[PDB]
Structure formats: C-alpha cells, structure tokens
C-alpha cells in the first residue's frame, strides 16, 4: 500500500469537515456529528491499486495565513471545496484559494468539489438565497469554474445523504497516483 496525502481546502461553511467525517466513518453520524476532524488514514483500493490515503482538514485555519500553509507539505491531492447553497463561496475559489494552493502545492492535482448538492432541492435554501438576489450553484457554473482554475476535474456530493462521497475519495486517490 503506497502512502498518499489529501488536503481539503475551502471557506468556513463549505461542509469540508462533514465530508471528511462521513467518509472516515462510512455512515452519516446518527447521534452526534463531531465539531472537529483530527486526521484519518484511509485504506482505499482504486482500479486495483491499494493506497493508504491520509485525510487532512484546514477548518479553523482560514483566518491564520501563516499557520495554514503548514498543512500543505507533501500534499499529493487537493480537494477544493465550495458549498452549492452558497454562490459566494464559489466566487472566492479563483481569487483566494487557487492562488494559494498553486503557490504552496505546484503541479499538485486539484479536484473542485461542490458540497451540499441536496440543498439544490431545498425550499428554505431557495427562498433564503432569493432574498439576496441569488440561487444555488448550477452544475454548469461549477464545471465552468473547474475549467477556469485548471482543476483536474469537477465533482459534486452530499455528506448528508452520502451520495457521491465515495466517488470523490476514490477519484482523489486516482489523481494522487498520477505522476
């Protein structure tokens, strides 16, 4: 089993901690969802290759521009996260997270991930967004952003329903293997 490293980056309420918890537990926490994520080493087997995948979060470091880059050394794949119920989090991707991720992690594959895709069919979400002259992030808007930032690919998921969560991490493993 080769050891590869994954780091998930993104704004505060993009659901990156929830995504890492749901994958590292295999199910959605039925009693209590932890506030924090320490680390986890995944035993993923993708396309016949056995890989050990270290999972790391950057939650709580978005305000500390000198502590944050310390999660980047030896990163093999970057999960660039945004929330589908927050068009503003997608707007910050090209001008805040992309310049930093490319500076500290050159030549490292970035997968743009749209979290909370379930909320695209949530009435409260569509009403709350409409009051601020907005709507949930469309699939083509997310795809266009990955195209623009030079991302390796674009994926969507929902940690609440576990839908697409496994495919993101199996694809992140594939991306980390490419040399």
Partner 1 sequence: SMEMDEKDFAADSWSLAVDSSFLQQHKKEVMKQQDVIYELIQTELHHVRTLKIMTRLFRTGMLEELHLEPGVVQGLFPCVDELSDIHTRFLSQLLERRRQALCPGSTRNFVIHRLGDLLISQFSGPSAEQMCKTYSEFCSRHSKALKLYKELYARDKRFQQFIRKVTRPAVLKRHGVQECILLVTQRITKYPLLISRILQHSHGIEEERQDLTTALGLVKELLSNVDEGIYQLEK
Please enumerate, by residue number, every residue annotated as part of a binding site.
10-17, 28-35, 57-61, 115-118, 158-160
Out of 6, 20, 56, 137, name the contact with partner 1 by CB under 8 A: 56
Binding site, annotated residues for GTP: 10-17, 28-35, 57-61, 115-118, 158-160
- Interface residue with partner 1 among 26, 27, 47, 66 (CB under 8 A) is 66
Instruction: Give the whole-angstrom CA distance, residue 161 versus residue 166.
Output: 12
The residue (of 36 and 132) whose beta carbon lies closer to partner 1 is 36
**Close Cβ partners of 36 (under 8 Å, ≥ 6 residues apart):** 17, 59, 60
Stretch that binds partner 1, among 50-58, 114-122, 134-142, 155-163 (CB under 8 A): 50-58
Q: Are 139 and 156 in contact (CB under 8 A)?
A: yes
Least distance to partner 1, CB of residue 36, Å: 5
- Determine contact, residues 85/125, Cβ cutoff 8 Å: yes
């Amino acid at each position: 089993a080769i050891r590869k490293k994954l780091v998930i980056v993104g704004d505060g309420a993009c659901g990156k901690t929830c995504l890492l918890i749901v994958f590292s537990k295999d199910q959605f926490p039925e009693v209590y969802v932890p506030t924090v994520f320490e680390n986890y080493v995944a035993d993923i087997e993708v396309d016949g290759k056995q890989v050990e995948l270290a999972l790391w979060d950057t939650a709580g470091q978005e305000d500390y521009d000198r502590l944050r880059p310390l999660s980047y050394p030896d990163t093999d794949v970057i999960l660039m996260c945004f929330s589908i119920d927050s068009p503003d989090s997608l707007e910050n991707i090209p001008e805040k997270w992309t310049p930093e991720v490319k500076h500290f992690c050159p030549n490292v594959p970035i997968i743009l991930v749209g979290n909370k895709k379930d909320l695209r069919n949530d009435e409260h979400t569509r009403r709350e967004l409409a009051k601020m002259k907005q709507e949930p992030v469309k699939p083509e808007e997310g795809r266009d952003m990955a195209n623009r930032i030079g991302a390796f690919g674009y994926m969507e998921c929902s940690a609440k329903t576990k839908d697409g969560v496994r495919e993101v991490f199996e694809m992140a493993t594939r991306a980390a293997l490419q040399a």
